[PDB]
């Protein structure tokens, strides 16, 4: 924000694949705000990938989820993955950042930091929600975006 | 193919019935001896492990590139308890996540020979979870197919989705031996 | 009881901390479970070595849990070859407190060591207490008429 | 050999349709699934009295006995031997039955329990003990609790009931209620079992924990019953109110067993009266004089001394007697069941205890701060 900016215009919205998506609420809800949310159907786990132009720098994300406990708790972030990524390659691999979200970060008035050194030249970002703040079989995300600058 | 399979053998009380010659427990032992042997020649690196589907699931032998140890364990399996199919797949799926080599493909072989006493919603959600991890569970609906033909139908249809024959629901009517219908089933193809 | 005291060596603590770290790195884990190796001296246990074993449990259901007991046998033959005097004396798990399925896991552990001792090694650096809490499975015969159950009896631990 | 099923297919003691379903399972060789249908038919509501089902053993089930669950085989025969009334040959039926079911120890446990019940009926108590001491040993080897535990405890309790050992009956009756669900048992059975359990507790030797007894859900079946006085009598024993116990004499005196052991009952409540005095008073003022014990227990002052011996010898209370000063120095009492309010008072005591420990923790830390490592 201090010389950087939100980057959904860079996000192509065509190479974004949110696995474990639910037909009830899709990936569009959490990328546009205006209430609503994204949720999962098969399991609490929720894999998200985001694509855009290669020159993009990430400083912070704002993965604000709901308060009932369906907001993400442990999330895995991967960058520049050749080939597709299944749920195992997001669970059995080493993430760039594996920040464990607290309830304060989930709050809509909350922004989480990322290790900016490791997010410099990003082709695409893979996000793996592994758990939520509870035992809700579906995981919900109210809003999400990346704050940064192009390379 | 280079895939790791687990046989969810059933030892419930209904395995004492003589609907399959000579006994459903003995018939399924020949079934394992053929399906496990088939996975060996498909790929010498293929992994086969045994999981019992008793009242409480018990992993008798984990994944191994060995065939003989599977049958020796099945020799000591005695009929006892009731089927618990809900926990059997998850405990078999858990072993699949901890296989010898992660390049192997998911595959679970279930011997359903007793009715699954769960709601359709729980069975459906189990299929969605296995589809998440690209897990294919192959089930033979022998025994009580007259009442399991609908619960298992939702299982495979939800797992297979709309495209791809990942899992099969071959159902053998009672007869001489369910193994004689396995070599013609797509499981061994 | 069969155990008067359990002595956990610093090598086990470092191995358990490393075991929790390496598997915890790839995926967030509630706990990691391994096998405790040691000798027996009078009635005081001497837990001195440990190795990791594959383990996973579904959080929703305590009944669903997998422990690679074939790995457990295979790794024992390794450690027995190097050190024959270190035998299986129990298991460990890094969960902060006891779990409901621990009595079930102990039964799988009990067949390799009849007097299996579960030692809970807390990776989190507690300020006051010792990181280890040793337990043994005993038959609690109730006087209220309730049927006898398998409960963990605490055994004093020392590093 | 299957002609009897065909004979009953058209002209059968039961419903011909039932045999047809029974026939169909045999043809399909659904061997375990027939037993559930057999279980539903052995306890038939039509010809349970009739002797048509004894031949059901030799004709039908003996043919497929070789591949039936040994546990599920035995209780089928329990209702089979119910129809037969000849005592001695019932042994040969069960002994031959006991021989076949050898793979399952639970089946053997049920078999030996069956012989114990009818051999209790014939009055051979000496050998029903030898059986009871054997099946009890095997039950412990069996892990957990199974469907065979309940029938043993029912037999084990009935054994001690006829002999008269109320202390053992009280223990065993608790096990039976711990291995069955109350809602399943009939209200008449629950009411009857509560009365004999509480009666044994009063007459048992060493049965002083009436607090655990009082909240047994079994006793809740006597809240409004005419046997309400039994609950009140247990209340008197729990509180050690011998005056109440003498007051309900018009109620508990009518029972043949309670009246016969009124001397033992009076001694028991006198000991529980002693515990009540010790538990009521604080630890600073636990010096009971001889007059207080005599007055509260309705005993002569000279008999107070013997009363304390029984409490001290058995272990109900710990302490000493000062005969010169006529005072009893109790230092310990048996822990008892406590209400929520008493627990709240106990927690309040921890509040003061925690404050004192914390206060000195800061005191030593503040005073020895320089030398603290």
């Amino acid at each position: 924000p201090k010389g950087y900016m939100d980057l959904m215009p860079f996000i192509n919205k065509a190479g974004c694949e949110c696995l474990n998506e639910s037909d009830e609420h899709g990936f569009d809800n959490c990328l546009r705000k205006d209430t609503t949310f994204l949720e999962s159907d098969c399991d609490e786990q929720l894999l998200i990938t985001v694509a855009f132009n290669q020159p993009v720098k990430l400083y912070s994300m704002k993965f604000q989820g709901p308060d009932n406990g369906q907001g993400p708790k442990y999330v895995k972030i991967f960058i520049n993955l050749p080939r597709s990524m299944d749920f195992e390659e997001a669970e059995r691999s080493e993430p760039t950042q594996a920040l464990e979200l607290t309830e304060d970060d989930i709050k809509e008035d909350g922004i989480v930091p990322l290790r900016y050194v490791k997010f410099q030249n990003v082709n695409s970002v893979t996000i793996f929600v592994q758990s939520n703040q509870g035992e809700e079989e579906t995981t919900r995300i109210s809003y999400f975006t990346f704050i940064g600058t192009p390379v | 193919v280079l895939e790791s399979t687990m046989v969810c053998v059933d030892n419930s009380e209904y395995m004492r019935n003589g609907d399959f010659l000579p006994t459903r427990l003995q018939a399924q032992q020949d079934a394992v001896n053929i399906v496990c042997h088939s996975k060996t020649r498909s790929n010498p690196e293929n992994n086969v492990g045994l999981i019992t589907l008793a009242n409480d699931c018990e992993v008798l032998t984990t994944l191994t590139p060995d065939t003989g140890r599977i049958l020796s364990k099945l020799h000591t399996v005695q009929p006892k308890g009731k089927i618990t199919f809900c926990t059997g797949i998850r405990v078999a799926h858990l072993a699949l996540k901890h296989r010898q080599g992660k390049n192997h493909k998911m595959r679970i072989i279930a011997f359903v020979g007793s009715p699954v006493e769960d709601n359709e919603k729980d069975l459906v959600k189990l299929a969605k979870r296995l589809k998440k991890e690209k897990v294919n569970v192959d089930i033979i609906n022998f025994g009580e197919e007259e009442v399991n033909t609908e619960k298992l139908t939702a299982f495979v249809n939800t797992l297979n989705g709309k495209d791809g024959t990942g899992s099969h629901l071959v159902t053998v009517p009672p007869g001489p031996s369910l193994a004689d219908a396995l070599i013609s089933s797509p499981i061994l193809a | 009881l069969a155990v008067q005291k359990v002595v956990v060596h610093p090598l086990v603590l470092l191995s358990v901390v490393d075991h929790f770290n390496r598997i915890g790195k790839v995926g967030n884990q509630k706990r990691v479970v391994g096998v405790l190796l040691g000798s027996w001296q009078k009635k005081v246990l001497d837990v001195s070595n440990s190795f990791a074993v594959p383990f996973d449990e579904d959080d929703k259901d305590d009944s669903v849990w997998f422990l690679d007991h074939d790995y457990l046998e295979n790794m024992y033959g390794m450690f027995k070859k190097v050190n024959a005097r270190e035998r299986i004396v129990g298991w460990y798990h890094t969960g902060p407190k006891l779990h409901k399925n621990d009595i079930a896991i102990n039964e799988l552990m009990k067949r390799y060591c009849p007097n299996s001792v579960l030692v809970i090694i807390d990776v989190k650096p507690k300020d006051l207490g010792l990181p280890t809490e040793a337990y043994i499975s005993v038959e609690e015969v109730h006087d209220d008429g309730t049927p006898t159950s398998k409960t963990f009896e605490h055994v004093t631990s020392e590093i | 050999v299957p002609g009897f099923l065909q004979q009953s297919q058209n002209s059968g003691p039961g419903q011909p349709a039932v045999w047809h379903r029974l026939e169909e399972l045999y043809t399909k060789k659904l061997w375990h699934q027939l037993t559930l249908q057999v279980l539903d038919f052995v306890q038939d509501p039509c010809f349970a009295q009739g002797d048509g089902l004894i031949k059901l053993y030799e004709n039908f089930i003996s043919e497929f006995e070789h591949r039936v669950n040994p546990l599920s085989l035995v209780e089928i025969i329990l209702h089979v031997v119910r129809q037969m009334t000849d005592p001695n040959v019932a042994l040969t039926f069960l002994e031959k039955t006991r021989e076949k079911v050898k793979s399952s120890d639970e089946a053997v446990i049920l078999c030996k329990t069956a012989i114990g019940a009818l051999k209790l009926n014939i009055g051979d108590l000496q050998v029903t003990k030898e059986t009871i001491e054997d099946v009890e040993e095997m039950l412990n080897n069996l892990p957990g609790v199974t469907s065979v535990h309940s029938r043993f405890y029912d037999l084990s309790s009935k054994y001690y009931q006829t002999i008269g050992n109320h202390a053992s009956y009280y223990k065993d009756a608790l096990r039976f209620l711990g291995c069955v669900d109350i809602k399943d048992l009939p209200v008449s059975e629950q009411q009857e079992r509560a009365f004999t359990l509480g009666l044994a507790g009063l007459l048992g030797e060493g049965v002083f924990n009436f607090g655990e007894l009082l909240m047994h859900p079994v006793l809740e079946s006597l809240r409004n019953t005419d046997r309400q006085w039994l609950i009140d009598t247990l209340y008197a024993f729990n509180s050690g109110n011998v005056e109440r116990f003498q007051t309900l004499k018009t109620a508990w005196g009518q029972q043949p067993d309670l009246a016969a052991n009124e001397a033992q009952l009076l001694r028991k409540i006198q000991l529980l009266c002693l515990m009540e005095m010790t538990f009521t008073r604080p630890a600073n003022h636990r010096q009971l004089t001889f007059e207080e014990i005599a007055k509260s227990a309705k005993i002569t002052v000279n008999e107070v001394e013997l009363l304390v011996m029984k409490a001290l010898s058995v272990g109900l209370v710990k302490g000493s007697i000062d005969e010169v000063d006529k005072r009893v120095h109790m230092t310990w009492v048996q822990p008892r069941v406590l209400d929520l309010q008493q627990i709240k008072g106990m927690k309040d005591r921890l509040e003061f205890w925690c404050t004192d420990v914390k206060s000195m923790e800061m005191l030593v830390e503040h005073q020895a701060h320089d030398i603290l490592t």
Side-chain angles (χ1 to χ4, degrees):
Chain A
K2 289 282 157 172
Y4 327 123
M5 210 44 172
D6 58 71
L7 294 133
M8 55 314 302
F10 250 91
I11 301 175
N12 48 24
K13 264 81 103 186
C16 57
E17 160 197 276
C18 155
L19 297 173
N20 233 20
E21 206 184 272
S22 91
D23 55 342
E24 307 300 300
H25 314 49
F27 189 39
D28 178 53
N29 314 41
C30 71
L31 296 173
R32 140 201 66 81
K33 182 30 193 84
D34 288 350
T35 181
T36 59
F37 63 97
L38 172 69
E39 82 172 349
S40 60
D41 55 358
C42 328
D43 189 15
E44 176 179 347
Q45 278 190 318
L46 167 47
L47 182 67
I48 308 147
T49 207
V50 172
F52 36 54
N53 289 338
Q54 307 196 137
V56 161
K57 270 201 192 341
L58 291 44
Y59 286 84
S60 61
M61 58 158 39
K62 53 173 51 184
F63 246 134
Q64 315 146 354
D67 163 77
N68 49 288
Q70 271 155 332
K73 158 79 152 254
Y74 184 80
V75 86
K76 307 262 275 282
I77 303 183
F78 307 87
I79 331 167
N80 320 328
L81 265 303
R83 295 133 38 259
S84 89
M85 51 310 301
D86 68 352
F87 266 80
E88 232 178 19
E89 288 173 351
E91 206 155 7
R92 255 47 180 254
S93 300
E94 223 65 42
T96 58
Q97 205 159 342
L99 61 175
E100 182 180 1
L101 290 176
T102 84
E103 260 304 315
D104 200 297
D105 325 287
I106 267 173
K107 297 174 182 177
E108 294 175 352
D109 201 41
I111 175 68
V112 318
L114 292 52
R115 296 326 233 244
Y116 167 67
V117 151
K118 281 135 51 178
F119 307 75
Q120 294 305 295
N121 200 92
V122 303
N123 201 350
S124 34
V125 161
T126 302
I127 289 163
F128 171 52
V129 152
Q130 183 167 348
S131 169
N132 64 4
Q133 309 283 352
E135 298 235 291
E136 309 65 24
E137 293 86 357
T138 167
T139 325
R140 311 184 156 162
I141 293 159
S142 321
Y143 181 66
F144 152 76
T145 186
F146 275 127
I147 279 43
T149 174
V151 166
Chain B
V1 86
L2 187 58
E3 79 159 4
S4 69
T5 90
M6 275 258 293
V7 282
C8 277
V9 315
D10 159 1
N11 76 353
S12 61
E13 271 316 303
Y14 297 168
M15 291 287 126
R16 264 184 263 231
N17 310 22
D19 200 9
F20 297 72
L21 316 179
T23 319
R24 299 215 258 218
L25 184 129
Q26 273 294 246
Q28 90 175 324
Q29 189 150 195
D30 311 0
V32 152
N33 192 71
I34 268 49
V35 64
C36 154
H37 223 71
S38 152
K39 303 287 188 179
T40 310
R41 290 169 325 271
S42 210
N43 212 324
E45 288 196 312
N46 268 335
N47 255 348
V48 158
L50 205 147
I51 166 61
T52 298
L53 257 286
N55 50 331
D56 281 336
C57 322
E58 177 140 90
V59 188
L60 266 181
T61 316
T62 50
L63 283 56
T64 177
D66 180 306
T67 287
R69 225 162 30 211
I70 293 325
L71 298 323
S72 34
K73 295 318 271 153
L74 254 184
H75 280 329
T76 36
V77 185
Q78 300 300 47
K80 178 183 53 39
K82 202 155 20 183
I83 190 73
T84 206
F85 193 66
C86 278
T87 89
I89 294 318
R90 328 221 289 248
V91 79
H93 167 230
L94 251 64
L96 257 300
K97 258 165 57 103
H98 291 276
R99 71 209 92 141
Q100 270 304 354
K102 268 66 188 331
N103 268 136
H104 293 200
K105 344 294 271 183
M106 302 303 237
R107 162 67 34 81
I108 271 178
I109 284 163
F111 280 177
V112 176
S114 282
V116 182
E117 60 287 322
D118 67 352
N119 218 34
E120 314 304 319
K121 213 70 171 266
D122 323 291
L123 246 201
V124 165
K125 78 102 210 181
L126 200 40
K128 320 168 142 214
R129 292 184 25 109
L130 302 153
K131 188 183 184 174
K132 183 171 77 74
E133 271 64 31
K134 307 192 178 189
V135 185
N136 304 350
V137 46
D138 274 309
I139 307 183
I140 41 185
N141 192 15
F142 84 123
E144 307 319 299
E145 64 269 69
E146 44 268 58
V147 72
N148 310 352
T149 199
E150 201 56 43
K151 320 179 200 161
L152 315 203
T153 295
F155 206 165
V156 199
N157 291 359
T158 36
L159 183 161
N160 294 2
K162 274 73 53 200
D163 280 349
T165 80
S167 281
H168 335 306
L169 194 47
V170 85
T171 305
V172 64
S177 297
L178 90 164
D180 310 357
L182 269 200
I183 39 77
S184 59
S185 311
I187 289 76
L188 259 78
Chain C
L1 287 177
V3 202
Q4 187 223 341
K5 173 166 55 113
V6 168
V7 175
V8 176
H9 287 220
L11 184 70
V12 168
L13 294 183
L14 289 195
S15 310
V16 171
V17 160
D18 185 19
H19 175 204
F20 175 73
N21 278 347
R22 55 183 161 128
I23 284 165
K25 266 177 176 354
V26 247
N28 194 30
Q29 267 260 47
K30 183 62 159 63
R31 64 161 137 131
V32 304
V33 177
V35 179
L36 285 184
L37 270 44
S39 72
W40 261 109
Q41 219 92 336
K42 316 295 196 353
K43 265 193 172 185
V44 52
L45 202 36
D46 206 351
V47 172
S48 63
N49 209 348
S50 75
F51 58 82
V53 292
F55 174 84
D56 201 8
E57 43 186 22
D58 175 16
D59 307 16
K60 313 277 167 157
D61 202 21
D62 275 274
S63 320
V64 155
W65 61 268
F66 150 73
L67 200 142
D68 200 338
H69 77 264
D70 262 309
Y71 188 108
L72 193 152
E73 304 170 313
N74 273 221
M75 197 76 179
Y76 188 9
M78 297 246 171
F79 273 70
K80 193 191 331 179
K81 219 181 306 321
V82 182
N83 201 349
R85 269 165 182 209
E86 273 181 318
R87 338 210 53 81
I88 288 190
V89 296
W91 57 298
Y92 71 83
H93 78 81
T94 73
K97 281 99 135 160
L98 279 152
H99 290 35
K100 306 196 196 177
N101 60 78
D102 284 356
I103 221 67
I105 303 183
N106 200 2
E107 275 322 304
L108 165 63
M109 269 324 273
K110 257 187 104 55
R111 88 177 47 131
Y112 308 65
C113 160
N115 47 309
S116 196
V117 165
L118 156 71
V119 174
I120 293 184
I121 297 187
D122 198 12
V123 286
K124 296 313 165 58
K126 216 47 75 176
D127 42 346
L128 50 144
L130 286 182
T132 67
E133 282 179 343
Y135 299 99
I136 193 173
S137 189
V138 291
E139 304 287 305
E140 203 187 24
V141 316
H142 314 137
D143 258 350
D144 295 59
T146 36
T148 298
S149 59
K150 267 158 217 193
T151 78
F152 274 119
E153 172 97 325
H154 157 282
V155 152
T156 164
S157 268
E158 142 196 314
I159 308 292
Chain D
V1 188
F4 162 64
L5 154 75
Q6 309 147 12
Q7 281 176 18
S8 41
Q9 262 163 15
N10 319 58
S11 67
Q15 309 330 89
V18 173
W19 308 91
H20 299 336
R21 312 315 110 181
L22 189 122
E23 162 258 292
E24 280 149 36
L25 298 191
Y26 212 135
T27 51
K28 298 174 175 180
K29 280 193 177 175
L30 314 179
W31 283 42
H32 178 268
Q33 306 190 183
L34 80 76
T35 74
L36 295 318
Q37 202 46 263
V38 157
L39 188 73
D40 218 321
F41 182 73
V42 164
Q43 273 187 359
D44 67 18
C46 163
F47 265 23
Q49 143 52 14
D51 285 1
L53 301 192
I54 167 64
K55 83 204 55 157
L56 197 274
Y57 173 69
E58 301 94 344
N59 302 353
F60 194 22
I61 66 96
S62 325
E63 320 289 343
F64 61 81
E65 166 295 334
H66 54 290
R67 244 181 298 116
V68 72
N69 174 217
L71 189 267
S72 324
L73 167 41
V74 171
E75 97 293 339
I76 281 313
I77 306 165
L78 273 304
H79 322 101
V80 157
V81 314
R82 174 127 76 200
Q83 260 137 2
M84 149 207 297
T85 48
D86 210 288
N88 38 343
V89 301
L91 261 278
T92 46
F93 201 162
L94 307 155
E95 181 47 34
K96 177 209 316 292
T97 294
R98 214 201 38 80
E99 185 264 346
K100 309 191 244 323
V101 284
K102 206 63 51 55
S103 48
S104 273
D105 268 349
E106 319 87 336
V108 154
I109 293 267
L110 196 36
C111 261
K112 312 190 134 82
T113 321
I115 86 167
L118 45 77
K119 221 184 216 53
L120 240 187
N121 217 240
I122 75 168
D124 188 328
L125 330 174
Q126 180 64 33
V127 81
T128 207
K129 216 187 324 292
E130 312 152 24
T131 64
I132 223 174
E133 86 149 355
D134 228 15
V135 47
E136 166 63 57
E137 199 251 1
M138 320 180 18
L139 220 32
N140 308 341
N141 300 11
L142 189 66
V145 69
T146 77
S147 40
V148 317
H149 270 73
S150 290
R151 270 169 290 231
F152 168 100
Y153 294 137
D154 170 38
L155 174 288
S156 208
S157 43
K158 255 171 320 176
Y159 161 61
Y160 289 111
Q161 169 93 87
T162 167
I163 271 293
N165 200 204
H166 309 280
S168 325
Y169 178 86
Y170 176 81
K171 162 182 307 333
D172 291 10
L174 289 177
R175 277 97 155 290
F176 178 85
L177 307 156
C179 305
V180 316
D181 226 3
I182 284 268
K183 323 302 295 312
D184 315 336
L185 295 185
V187 174
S188 171
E189 283 201 21
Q190 302 169 22
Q191 256 156 10
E192 150 79 8
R193 264 191 191 305
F195 178 83
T196 171
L197 174 71
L199 193 136
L202 295 193
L203 285 50
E205 227 42 47
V207 183
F208 293 94
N209 213 343
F210 284 113
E212 301 200 293
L213 177 150
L214 273 184
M215 65 204 33
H216 220 303
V218 181
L219 290 190
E220 289 258 47
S221 64
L222 288 40
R223 294 316 294 283
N224 206 18
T225 322
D226 86 86
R227 313 225 208 71
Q228 176 47 287
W229 57 266
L230 186 272
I231 288 321
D232 301 31
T233 314
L234 299 159
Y235 272 138
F237 271 74
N238 196 81
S239 212
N241 214 332
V242 298
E243 159 197 312
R244 251 278 176 178
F245 181 72
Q246 297 165 12
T247 298
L248 302 96
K249 211 202 150 29
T250 59
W252 64 260
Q254 278 152 329
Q255 156 72 216
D257 258 7
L258 298 194
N261 309 35
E262 106 289 359
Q264 189 248 343
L265 275 190
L266 188 65
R267 193 65 164 181
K268 212 166 181 343
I269 188 150
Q270 278 167 9
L271 291 171
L272 295 159
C273 173
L274 193 53
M275 328 216 292
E276 173 80 7
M277 320 186 21
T278 64
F279 177 72
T280 305
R281 305 185 173 41
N284 332 289
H285 307 77
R286 248 179 216 173
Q287 318 230 344
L288 326 168
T289 85
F290 277 16
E291 286 247 14
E292 325 209 302
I293 307 182
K295 218 175 48 55
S296 315
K298 323 294 252 174
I299 64 170
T300 288
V301 190
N302 317 311
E303 313 188 341
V304 164
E305 233 158 288
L306 269 291
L307 183 64
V308 188
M309 311 273 216
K310 236 296 182 176
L312 285 171
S313 80
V314 152
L316 302 181
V317 300
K318 273 185 205 64
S320 325
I321 320 176
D322 210 74
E323 201 265 337
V324 180
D325 279 337
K326 308 261 136 53
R327 284 177 161 272
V328 188
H329 289 54
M330 316 269 86
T331 81
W332 176 87
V333 206
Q334 277 250 297
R336 72 218 290 120
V337 178
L338 296 186
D339 195 18
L340 273 309
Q341 326 179 31
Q342 246 162 351
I343 291 176
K344 281 194 289 282
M346 178 163 324
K347 184 200 81 52
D348 292 13
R349 194 185 324 317
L350 277 153
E351 297 271 353
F352 306 129
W353 195 6
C354 291
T355 307
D356 263 42
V357 182
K358 168 67 82 61
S359 296
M360 279 255 201
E361 162 194 341
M362 311 251 265
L363 195 128
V364 187
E365 261 187 327
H366 189 282
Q367 226 71 41
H369 159 77
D370 316 59
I371 76 168
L372 260 204
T373 84

